[PDB]
Design a binder for these strands. Sequence first.
RNA 1: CACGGACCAAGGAGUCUAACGUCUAUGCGAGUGUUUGGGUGUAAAACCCAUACGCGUAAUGAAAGUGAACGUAGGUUGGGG
RNA 2: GUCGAAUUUGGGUAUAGGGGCGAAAGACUAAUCGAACCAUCUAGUAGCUGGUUCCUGCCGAAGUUUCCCUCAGGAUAGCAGAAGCUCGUAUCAGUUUUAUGAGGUAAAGCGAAUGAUUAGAGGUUCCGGGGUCGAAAUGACCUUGACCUAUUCUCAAACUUUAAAUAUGUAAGAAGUCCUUGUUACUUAAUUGAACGUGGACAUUUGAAUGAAGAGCUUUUAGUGGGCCAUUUUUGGUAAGC
RNA 3: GUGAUUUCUGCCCAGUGCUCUGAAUGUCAAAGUGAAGAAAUUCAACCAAGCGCGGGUAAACGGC
RNA 4: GAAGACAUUGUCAGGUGGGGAGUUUGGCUGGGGCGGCACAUCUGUUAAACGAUAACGCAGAUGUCCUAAGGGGGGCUCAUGGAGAACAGAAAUCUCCAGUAGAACAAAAGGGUAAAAGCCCCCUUGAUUUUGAUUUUCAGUGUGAAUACAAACCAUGAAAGUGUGGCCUAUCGAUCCUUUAGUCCCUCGGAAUUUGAGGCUAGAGGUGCCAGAAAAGUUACCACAGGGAUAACUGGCUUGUG
Lengths: 93, 217, 50, 245
Amino acid sequence: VNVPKTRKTYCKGKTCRKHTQHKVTQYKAGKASLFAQGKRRYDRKQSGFGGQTKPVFHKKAKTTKKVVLRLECVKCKTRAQLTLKRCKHFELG
Amino acid sequence: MSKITSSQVREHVKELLKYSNETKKRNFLETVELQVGLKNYDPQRDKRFSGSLKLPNCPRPNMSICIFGDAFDVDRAKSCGVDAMSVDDLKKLNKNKKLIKKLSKKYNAFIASEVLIKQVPRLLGPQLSKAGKFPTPVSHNDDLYGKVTDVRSTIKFQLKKVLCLAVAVGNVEMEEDVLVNQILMSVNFFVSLLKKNWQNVGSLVVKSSMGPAFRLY
Amino acid sequence: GRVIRNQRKGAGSIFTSHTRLRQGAAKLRTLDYAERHGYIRGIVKQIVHD
Amino acid sequence: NTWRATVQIRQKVPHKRTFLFLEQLILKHNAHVDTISISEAKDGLDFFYAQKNHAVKMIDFLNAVVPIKHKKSEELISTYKFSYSVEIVPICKDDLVVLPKKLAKSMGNISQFVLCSKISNTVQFMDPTTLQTADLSPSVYWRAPFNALADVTQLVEFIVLDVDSTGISRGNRVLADITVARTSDLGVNDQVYYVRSHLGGICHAGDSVMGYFIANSNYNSDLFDGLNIDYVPDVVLVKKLYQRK
RNA sequence: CACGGACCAAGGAGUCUAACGUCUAUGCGAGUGUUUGGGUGUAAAACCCAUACGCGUAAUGAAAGUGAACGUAGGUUGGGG
RNA sequence: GUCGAAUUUGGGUAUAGGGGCGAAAGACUAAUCGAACCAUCUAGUAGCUGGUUCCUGCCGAAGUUUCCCUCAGGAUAGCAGAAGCUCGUAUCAGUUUUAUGAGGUAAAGCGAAUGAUUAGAGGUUCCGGGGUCGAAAUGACCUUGACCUAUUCUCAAACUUUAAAUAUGUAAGAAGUCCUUGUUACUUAAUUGAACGUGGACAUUUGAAUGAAGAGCUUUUAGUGGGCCAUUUUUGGUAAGC
RNA sequence: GUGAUUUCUGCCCAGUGCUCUGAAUGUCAAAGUGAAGAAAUUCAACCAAGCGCGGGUAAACGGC
RNA sequence: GAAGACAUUGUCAGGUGGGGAGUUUGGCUGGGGCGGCACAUCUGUUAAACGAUAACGCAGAUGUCCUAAGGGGGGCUCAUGGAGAACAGAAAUCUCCAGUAGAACAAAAGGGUAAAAGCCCCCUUGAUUUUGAUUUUCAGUGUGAAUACAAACCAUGAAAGUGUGGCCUAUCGAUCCUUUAGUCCCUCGGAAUUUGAGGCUAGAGGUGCCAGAAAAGUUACCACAGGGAUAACUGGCUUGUG
Ligand SMILES: [Mg+2]
Ligand SMILES: [Mg+2]
Ligand SMILES: [Mg+2]
Ligand SMILES: [Mg+2]
Ligand SMILES: [Mg+2]
Ligand SMILES: [Mg+2]
Ligand SMILES: [Mg+2]
Ligand SMILES: [Mg+2]
Ligand SMILES: [Mg+2]
Ligand SMILES: [Mg+2]
Ligand SMILES: [Mg+2]
Ligand SMILES: [Mg+2]
Ligand SMILES: [Mg+2]
Ligand SMILES: [Mg+2]
Ligand SMILES: [Mg+2]
Ligand SMILES: [Mg+2]
Ligand SMILES: [Mg+2]
Ligand SMILES: [Mg+2]
Ligand SMILES: [Mg+2]
Ligand SMILES: [Mg+2]
Ligand SMILES: [Mg+2]
Ligand SMILES: [Mg+2]
Ligand SMILES: [Mg+2]
Ligand SMILES: [Mg+2]
Ligand SMILES: [Mg+2]
Ligand SMILES: [Mg+2]
Ligand SMILES: [Mg+2]
Ligand SMILES: [Mg+2]
Ligand SMILES: [Mg+2]
Ligand SMILES: [Mg+2]
């Protein structure tokens, strides 16, 4: 699918509150090790004797993924997110 | 790199503009180019990245772009007063194999017709792209003078087998603050183009085309 | 499974050596001053089966 | 309940390329001498046999042409029907594969990001970026199986702009380096790609070549996302079209 | 032609506890609960009692926090007496 | 069978339970051995089998819906009992009539447009699907089929023009009708409407029939969640108590 | 492992094992090293055996 | 005598390790297994003229595709046949007449559509923000999909209007854990500042056994708790003539 990298939509910033122009990028993610409560809990549960202690998922069925767009306002610098359907090829031409 | 309080580049640009024409008032060859060497990246192991980051500020006015096209863009090129070419002319150019390797040297670039560029891939044969002169297309309703201005002001960072990419980023003519804006734009484009957004860039140098000993970057 | 036979041979219960009719351990004379500096003479009295 | 032997050949792929090669080879050797009947299916076919001798020699013939795994099953009527379930390895030639890490390390320390280059009684993978092959056997596949990344439907076209070389060849394949562009924006953009490939001796500047475009791709694969980002390329080139007329 | 049963006597299987829901009875009622303890005794009973504490009389919010009358504590439709 | 030895045997001594010992049978280890015996944890757990103790009265079922690593089991709804509470002939019904909707099966008709599987001969640069090679394209090697070509009668549960019977939704008034004129931040060009009202008029029938064992409402909980047979209409299997 | 005597025990090291008088970073843990940071930390280089590459072995399993 | 700050010994770390330990080894099903998915969905038929209705019944589809193939406006008419025009010959381009759709509308089938929902152009981003109500499956829970308003901001058009993705009927996913967007936001409890962490509102990362365990065989050496198996009787068949 093709989506242009510019789009005029509504933004809910306190200064704008109207239809403004945004530019479009795609969303990605990160992670954290000596920070997050789940990781700090899992490591202590994992230490010692006993084995694995949590499930491990290996029965993947989907082959594609939904795509999320991040929109940044050119006059406000207030981002917004918008999800699309499942597609196999995506670009921002 | 992530930008580093550009007053050092400001003093370097001032020393370069006092080197050119204030200690050697040479003939008009103003081109204050920025040379950048990258560090900590393997050419074969990493992807060979490239982009073009065309700033409208111009420094190389004398350029050769033999507009290859059809009849209507030939008349448009004759109006814009630039060196054009014809269809039978390009057919003779692909006929004589030695003429292409010379016409790639008598020209400085090229600008093709969105009606004949999907043939320069095969008709005008190889070594044009090896000399990095693959023509950029121009439409049937866009301005030819504006496209020639853009093809004279369009700079392109490409990753070769060497980590020493240099670009004619400015002229030594004038406009210290506009030159500072050009240096900021080039540094931003290189830092965003590299894989690590700050760490990979090592060597930055200014040289006003005269083998000047004023880099200070 | 269970403990196999070559594993069982190391506890040494019914796998020890049968040493009743043996004449004694066969070894050389202890090194001392006479063998270290000169020589000494003995005599062989009997040649036996072990 | 009237045959006593059934052989069921299956391949769980929409585009059954290895299965159609197998059908051409069965038709070109005429191994279907003693078939009672043939049942079509969605992913293969069933051959029928009056005694199990022709069935086991069909298994013997199939065990040396294609990478398969077969299992035996016993039926009762109240004298015993037999059923032979044969599965072909669902990886066809010119398909793009990400390998498991331990298998890739044990199979010659090859890259995980490979291409299926030849199918025989075993299967053969090859790294297109550096010319290097590997042989995977059906039993070591079926010990812990995996799937392919992309099949031959998302092959996009590419226009070759320029060729170089590196000198290294391993016979029939000259590992070179070519600059290329897409035929959906060659007359639109200034976007060029630089691909180190094994289509160096076969390709010259100005023609069309099929490939995988990784930079426009939504891949949901744990083997893929366990890779590194910089060591996966943008384009993987597979084959040249070259239509005469 | 399913399983148990030769005959007789005796024994033999929804119990108790902690915390609860609905319904009923009783005592007091914006309150209610003496029995952890103390006083006393005809002595494991009965009788008497202080300060606390539990539940109820205020909700809502993840929290910081805020916290229930425009009016005969409102208008319309029915409504036993 | 063997009977002078890889013989037979007394006593002493050594090897102990996931251990021993085995010229090997999973053999033997105190009538116990594909992991001995003894006591305790221990009244181990059991969606599985058996049993479960006095009388009379009144009421009285289900084998079905949805979800569950569910199918010899649960939760949930239904069916049932008990406690009642607010009131007093309501406006209700496994029914008819009158009025007014919806349907596309039986029958008709195909020949009025759809009228079919089946074994169906060639016509190659009218198509060609792919499969194997190929330092690649005046590029070789393969076979289902494209298209029935100059063949019609033939008929339908997935075809249509008409169209029953049986079964099905709504209405048959007081929470109604009519006249007059109050509210509004909605609506109209408006003094128009829309919704809700004030005041007034209309009971011997208050707007078809027949019936009405009181009507309405709430809380709580049991068992059940293997069904089967008959007439009629049907689907799959020559067909069956399939 | 084979199973008195007699006679015959062919060829393959490729697959799986077992092995090593062979090359050198391909993978490469804790500890130690360096950089940025106020610091907790983050990033990077180096990196033992083993694995991988290379050689041996069939009266090893197999294969013809 | 030999060896020597090396072995040895202690702690952590990386390999190797059925020698040993513990555990597991889906469901439906004319018995299991193989096959298939009748396991989550969609169209026609079974299906007997409201709705509902089973079978490992039948004919097929789904895990996609699209910045236009979404939205608004304007102009035009499609398949096909006939008669004509140099090369022109089934079939190339032009002209006229007939043409109720026999064409097209991404994909299965069914429905719908002619100054259009089809074809060709012009402008665009309503495929936006905030949250309630309703319909289908239904326990009237969740998930998916859809309908009609309200309060904003926009598009298109002269305008009335239309527009909350695809003409309609399918195209998809909890808790826990990560991550992102937004709130001159709340907390770190002796008091502050800055990192770090935790919260609130709204999305993504996925469970296809699709209301959602993390999982290989063999037993003829076998064990336990239970449930089922035995003369032919078609509610009436069998004998000589495809
Ligand atoms: Mg540990
Ligand atoms: Mg001894
Ligand atoms: Mg009996
Ligand atoms: Mg008995
Ligand atoms: Mg008895
Ligand atoms: Mg009130
Ligand atoms: Mg004798
Ligand atoms: Mg021991
Ligand atoms: Mg015994
Ligand atoms: Mg019983
Ligand atoms: Mg009764
Ligand atoms: Mg009929
Ligand atoms: Mg009145
Ligand atoms: Mg129940
Ligand atoms: Mg039962
Ligand atoms: Mg070997
Ligand atoms: Mg480390
Ligand atoms: Mg090493
Ligand atoms: Mg030491
Ligand atoms: Mg082990
Ligand atoms: Mg085990
Ligand atoms: Mg089963
Ligand atoms: Mg069966
Ligand atoms: Mg019906
Ligand atoms: Mg449309
Ligand atoms: Mg819903
Ligand atoms: Mg989720
Ligand atoms: Mg399930
Ligand atoms: Mg389920
Ligand atoms: Mg048993």
